[PDB]
Amino acid sequence: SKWRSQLDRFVKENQQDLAALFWGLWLENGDSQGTIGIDLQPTPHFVYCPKDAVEKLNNNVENRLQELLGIIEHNQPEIEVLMIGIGKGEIKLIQFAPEPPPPVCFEQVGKDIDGLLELLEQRMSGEIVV
Amino acid sequence: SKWRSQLDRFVKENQQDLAALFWGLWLENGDSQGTIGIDLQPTPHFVYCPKDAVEKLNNNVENRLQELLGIIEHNQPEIEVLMIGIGKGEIKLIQFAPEPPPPVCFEQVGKDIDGLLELLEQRMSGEIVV
């Protein structure tokens, strides 16, 4: 269960870059691909999670995050970032309203999603271990 | 308006305590008093912002955050901390899903809301200035 607090600390230290990536992917995909996931195995990597898979997977003892589907539906990508981390099937909800908001974060980092994916995934490696 | 970034730094570094206070206030008051606000003057201090008051104050040119009212109505306090910082009439949304969730932060920090309020308020003093 320690990976949860490792993921928590990583998010805390990387909110602006995660917001830039969140917003960049929002621009390209909106919600058509589902929810941005961080699958932690075999090493942490960004994925998309269709709403079915989230419900299927929140339908599990270790999870059962109350109203998760509504939280995912009601997230406002212009002001707040939402992702889900996944370690051996258990969800940790990632949600934060950064400063500046995600679209400004995107403009201020000045990186495309490919650049942010590689930078963030390198940073995760060996920092979050399941 | 540097206070927006100082408040962002404060929240990032104090998620557990703010989560414990948020849930302690939920235990005490539920939604009977409105939304938890942080009034930044003369010193940052926690207040309650009734629904009508939030709305009137969001009805101002520096604010007009899209879907603010809906974010407030949909907040899931077992999962999500929600507060609004208020600096010279400027709203800043605070929303984040802590690790562990808010009711566990309250249990783990082992203090009542009076203790939490005093600690968090002294901490913010000097650190977030308008």
Author numbering:
A (entry chain B), B (entry chain A): 13 to 142
From the paper:
The carboxysome is a natural proteinaceous organelle for carbon fixation in cyanobacteria and chemoautotrophs. It comprises hundreds of protein homologs that self-assemble to form a polyhedral shell structure to sequester cargo enzymes, ribulose 1,5-bisphosphate carboxylase/oxygenase (Rubisco), and carbonic anhydrases. Recent studies have identified the chaperone protein CcmS, which can interact with CcmK1, facilitating β-carboxysome assembly in Syn6803. Here, we determined the structure of the chaperone protein CcmS, which has recently been identified to be involved in β-carboxysome assembly, and its interactions with β-carboxysome proteins.
In the Nos7120 genome, the ccmS gene is located within the gene clusters expressing β-carboxysome proteins and carboxysome-related proteins. ccmS in Nos7120 encodes a protein of 142 amino acids. As determined by SDS-PAGE and Native-PAGE, CcmS functions as a dimer in solution, with the molecular mass of ∼16 kDa for each CcmS monomer. We solved the 1.99 Å crystal structure of the CcmS dimer in space group P212121 by molecular replacement. Two molecules of CcmS form a homodimer in the asymmetric unit, and each CcmS monomer consists of five α-helices and four β-sheets. The two CcmS molecules are rotated symmetrically, with an interaction interface of ∼900 Å2, primarily mediated by hydrogen bonds and salt bridges. Key interactions at the CcmS dimer interface are formed by Arg16-Glu111, Ala109-Gln107, Pro110-Lys104, Asp20-Glu111, and Lys104-Glu111 residues. These residues are highly conserved, suggesting that the dimerization of CcmS is ubiquitous among various β-cyanobacterial species.
